[PDB]
């Protein structure tokens, strides 16, 4: 990306992570797992839900094993209908999407 030396590995992790939205409340993390695996190898992922009934908020994130694989998700999954809801997949490293993660309370 920048082409600069980075000592913080969290930067590369953020770059290879994406922010996923428009997730059906009927969808599970296991269903999302499959959706993510269609793109490529995955490190981690989470679906954020309301701490009450358990109903998903429809937002989460996915960490891929490669930054280009994460970009492939942004290419493929972003705008792709998932059980009625067209998924939004952005770069988690983006300030806006990080603030969205803060709103979700993921860190």
UniProtKB/Swiss-Prot annotation:
It is found in: Nucleus. Induction: Up-regulated during the G0 to S phase transition. The modification Phosphoserine is found at residue 14. Residues 16-94 form the RRM domain. It is linked to Intellectual developmental disorder, X-linked 113: A disorder characterized by mild intellectual disability, and developmental delay mainly affecting verbal and non-verbal communication skills. Motor development is normal. One of the multiple factors required for polyadenylation and 3'-end cleavage of mammalian pre-mRNAs. This subunit is directly involved in the binding to pre-mRNAs. The CSTF complex is composed of CSTF1 (50 kDa subunit), CSTF2 (64 kDa subunit) and CSTF3 (77 kDa subunit). CSTF2 directly interacts with CSTF3, SYMPK and RPO2TC1. Interacts with HSF1 in heat-stressed cells. Interacts with CPSF2, CPSF3 and FIP1L1. Interacts with DDX1. This is Cleavage stimulation factor subunit 2. It comes from Homo sapiens (Human). The gene is CSTF2.
